[PDB]
Design a protein around this ligand. Sequence first.
Ligand SMILES: [Mg+2]
Ligand SMILES: [Mg+2]
Lengths: 439, 138, 439, 122, 122
Amino acid sequence: LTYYTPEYETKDTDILAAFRVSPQPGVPPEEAGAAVAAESSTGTWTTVWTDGLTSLDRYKGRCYHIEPVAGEDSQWICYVAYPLDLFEEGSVTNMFTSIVGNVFGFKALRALRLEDLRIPPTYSKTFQGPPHGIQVERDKLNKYGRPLLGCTIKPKLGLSAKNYGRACYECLRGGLDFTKDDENVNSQPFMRWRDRFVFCAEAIYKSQAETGEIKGHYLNATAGTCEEMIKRAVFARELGVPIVMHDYLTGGFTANTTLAHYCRDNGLLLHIHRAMHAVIDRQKNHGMHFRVLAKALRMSGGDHIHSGTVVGEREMTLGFVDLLRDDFIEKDRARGIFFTQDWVSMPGVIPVASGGIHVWHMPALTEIFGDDSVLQFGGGTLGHPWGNAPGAAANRVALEACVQARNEGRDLAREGNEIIRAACKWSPELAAACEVWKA
Amino acid sequence: LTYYTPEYETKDTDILAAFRVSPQPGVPPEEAGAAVAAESSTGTWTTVWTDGLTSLDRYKGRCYHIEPVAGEDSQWICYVAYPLDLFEEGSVTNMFTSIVGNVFGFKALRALRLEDLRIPPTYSKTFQGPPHGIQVER
Amino acid sequence: LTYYTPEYETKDTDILAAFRVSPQPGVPPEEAGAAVAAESSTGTWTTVWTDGLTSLDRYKGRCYHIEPVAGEDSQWICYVAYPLDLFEEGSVTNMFTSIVGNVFGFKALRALRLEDLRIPPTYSKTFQGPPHGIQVERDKLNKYGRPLLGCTIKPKLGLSAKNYGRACYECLRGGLDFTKDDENVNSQPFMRWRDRFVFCAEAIYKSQAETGEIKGHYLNATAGTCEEMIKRAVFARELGVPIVMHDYLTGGFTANTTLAHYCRDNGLLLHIHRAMHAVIDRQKNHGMHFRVLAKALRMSGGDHIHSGTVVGEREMTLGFVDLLRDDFIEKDRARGIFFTQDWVSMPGVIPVASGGIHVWHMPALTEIFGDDSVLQFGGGTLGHPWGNAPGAAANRVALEACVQARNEGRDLAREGNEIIRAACKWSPELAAACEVWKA
Amino acid sequence: MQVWPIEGIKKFETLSYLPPLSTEALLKQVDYLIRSKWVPCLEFSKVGFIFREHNASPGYYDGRYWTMWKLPMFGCTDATQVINEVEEVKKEYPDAYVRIIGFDNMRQVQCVSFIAFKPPGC
Amino acid sequence: MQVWPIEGIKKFETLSYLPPLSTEALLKQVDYLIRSKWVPCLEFSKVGFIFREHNASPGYYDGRYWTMWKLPMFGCTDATQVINEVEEVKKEYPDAYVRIIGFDNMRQVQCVSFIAFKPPGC
Ligand SMILES: [Mg+2]
Ligand SMILES: [Mg+2]
């Protein structure tokens, strides 16, 4: 119908969306695609006289292209173009409201997934973006030429604030750049946030003074209200520490954007955790792919973002890691990049890999993500038989051995086990880590 | 395993969750439910000495009931109990982070849906709730 | 009558009260109990038409149980249950207004005492509670495995602020953890509060630098108005000192709760003094037992609370000290615990023993209260023949000798005098203290 | 009349006002931990005391944390094992302070701390 | 069980957890810069580590900058030239730390830093 316009030339100011559409039986792709377009824009069930007070064509979403999905006889990618004027400047909230607010409940569809968005420069330039971004962060921390290393403190709940800070000091002093608050750790009966912030600050400053290297702890500012979130960031600011944390999907985009602005204004790095993402991004037929949530974070603002474990599909991960880090990313269907994306010098976000990784993963992780990444342990440090500081040292040594080998021209994919084995000869900490975890 | 506790009596202060669990082929329902409980609470992939600085039993999610779903095959409803102390007072953000923050991505599940939550009075009384509500509005 | 409901099953959300009721001659316990219930709830002298606009049964206090008091032929304990909806969240003020606001003047009663309250978790969870509580305080001060020690400066009034701070430095440097402002010391002509705060801060920091141990002075913030109380806490905050003080009954619960919140937000410990309590809590037949005032303080908020001298009845003290410190306290009539009390992880309050105690009391005090207590001298330090620093050292030595002996498995109740005598052999300060005070 | 000294007697909290504990006396304090079902652990440091270098807001101090020696001795039933490790620290770090701490896995906190060795010369 | 040392092993970021790099190993790291089309440069300092003396607001530290030795070696195609300059610094400043850094004129930033010489005695 009138919302399927296959001859439309997209404008350089349009927001474009690629939807994976699964229509009900009997519903051709073209009116499914047209329904997505009309339902996520100007479509309404009966005619109305106020339409004649404007030019509706100027606000129509249009489905301008449809292609089949490989391996499916009832799934299509439908491309939809939305005019720039639909969107409130600087608001990820309004961008999602306008595009995914209504159409996922349409009855003629069995399922619907948003795969990708083309964010035009005219729109992305209305956002702050990362408080600092990759390059500024490396300069502030004086850290170059290797992935950054972190550890999440466990048990997440259980410890007193003091015992919690003790574990942080021991991790940091052994060679990790950062320690982190579990996503669940906000403020709770046996560890109130302000107590935790004081002891973690003592730990950060003790470990930095001991090692000579800059240290941080991702202090979780996630809270029930905006007022509490900002109170937490304000105290971190008072303590002079370098980095805070936010759970951006459960706290939400309005709060995240507020926090990103506060962090820009006060020189704080912002570590973003993606709790609840798999509620939305797991199933191939319905929801939103994480690369959409990743672009939205880059716009709303964060300096780090959790990006997986890669220990999903390699090519898809590599795809949205480029979308997070790079200035210009060309369309590349093999890597899940449905649109060419130009960020016109908005800083990039450092991807963070976490979840069940130990020293034997270091070659693969270094090879996959390269230097601009955070490798985040949590079990792989606190599970070392000699304790946290040696566990940290084992991970730092393994990483630096991989970086040295890579820089020398050695292939990490083929020689990683040998690289690690050679380092075990002079690092008893690494040797010990290598016999507990096996491969 | 240790996170499936079918004889557990729920506390009046517990937050209860009902999950619709779709395990991967060959993953028994009890393991799936235990995993949903362990992965939405304390489950850590290696042992850490700091567990000895506390009593983790106190903070464990527990799967205390499992039942099959009529209309389907390979779908179970699993009930999980979470202790009150896990949750930040007055924060829906923390409640969701804690319960649905991580478990939906677990490899051994094909799919997971949260169907209901028992919000105990001891937790809901820490929330303002509606600015006015039905009666005041009228 | 209709307010005596002996078959009522209490709800887990009810506030329960145990009243010691002394009716006028001719008044049976049942209508005395029913009068307490109706008079502390919905009872009114004539019928009113507005009652038909609601369901009064839902707001009735009910007397649900009556028992005789041992040794009395005209005194009963009457148990009353109040619905949760009667009470404003987070307000000790409203809890007392609602329960003890009116009924103590009822003419059919000769006397009335409130003995205990069952504070349900649904209600206590609406309160902050202690700004820090026992465990956090020990972690902040880095003090473990012994009672804390303090001294109240005397004369309360007389000294210049400077001479006052001099006495504080000498006490602290000799081994006390704290010094304290007399309850009467707020701001007065010859010692204005801000002057006192400056000199006590100089003293705290001199003694801490000399000994290597963390020191504090309970700076009294009690004042005529909320604005002045907070001005005083704000300056303590500026000075970076660890602890302030409040007289919670004479300042009052609205002010105390305000101060407890300020202390949570700013990392200050809060020492609570109970001036005027015996006006209310002394007489067995009328008033409120201190365990009621103690629960109310734990809810409103404090990190320490004066809890007696135990040098009253042992069992009653042990009773409300558990109610102050523990998470779960089972009903125990021998210890004055009328209701099982579950605090669902609200932190505990450190009890403070004071009033005429010297080195010879140390074994008994250590045995009665155990480690989580403050032993507060005031005469027993400033009365040492060699002055304050030796008096402090004598008390610190006596305490540590008792703790060492106890940990070794020795019985403090039987061997205390020998333990103290053995310490006198190597501590001339203790020997000197032991000849002035005798037993 | 004796004057309390102003130097040379900096302190380490609980039991540090007693004469330095003999091996026998130290063993009894470690046995108290074991009997209480608390977990012993050693800490050590080249700096003995609290200070304020990086911040001075209420409740913030530096020097409260020392460094952990190895790991907490979970399941230790023999006090002599603890005292032996004290000698190992002394061997590797001759001029370090050493203290014994104790973890209560039931109230979930650190609950003990006392000095085991002070370098003479300090 | 070995205890991670608390003294004598202050660090210099990337590659400083490895044994000190031999001349052969250093040459290979400089060759990596050249192959990457990055510009090598030497820095040096009498103070090895980060500190906070003049300000302590978030992201402010002192001691991040060291002093530049001469100029970046634009168009360097021979790693041995870089290693030779390291010996020149060592000659003029026997008790200075020396590190090799690298400039990426394409992403417009410093992108490498690693220690080349630490004075023994430190
Ligand atoms: Mg986590
Ligand atoms: Mg007094």
